[PDB]
Amino acid sequence: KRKRSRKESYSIYVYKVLKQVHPDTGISSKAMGIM
């Protein structure tokens, strides 16, 4: 096992900016996909 490739994405940085501008609001996986 331990495949799923390792696919890079901006989602940690998106979350990081989100917590700056709106610290109590989160984000669905589709919405993250669009970001």
Added chain:
DNA sequence: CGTACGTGCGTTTAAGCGGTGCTAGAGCTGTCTACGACCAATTGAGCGGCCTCGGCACCGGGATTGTGAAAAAAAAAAGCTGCA
């Protein structure tokens, strides 16, 4: 059914032409060095996997607020005059 737009005319304008004179700056060359690629070593930021726990989808009951449809009233219009 009313007039905005196409046609044609006379009047006016300035584009185009060709020419001249001047130079800003496009673009090329040579020099030199600050910067970015390249490399190996190192390791923590970010990856996948995994579990949890509350957001959010779904439910039922009733009040309330849009959202419109019909029915009822009000009005404007149509036809009819009876005098002066």
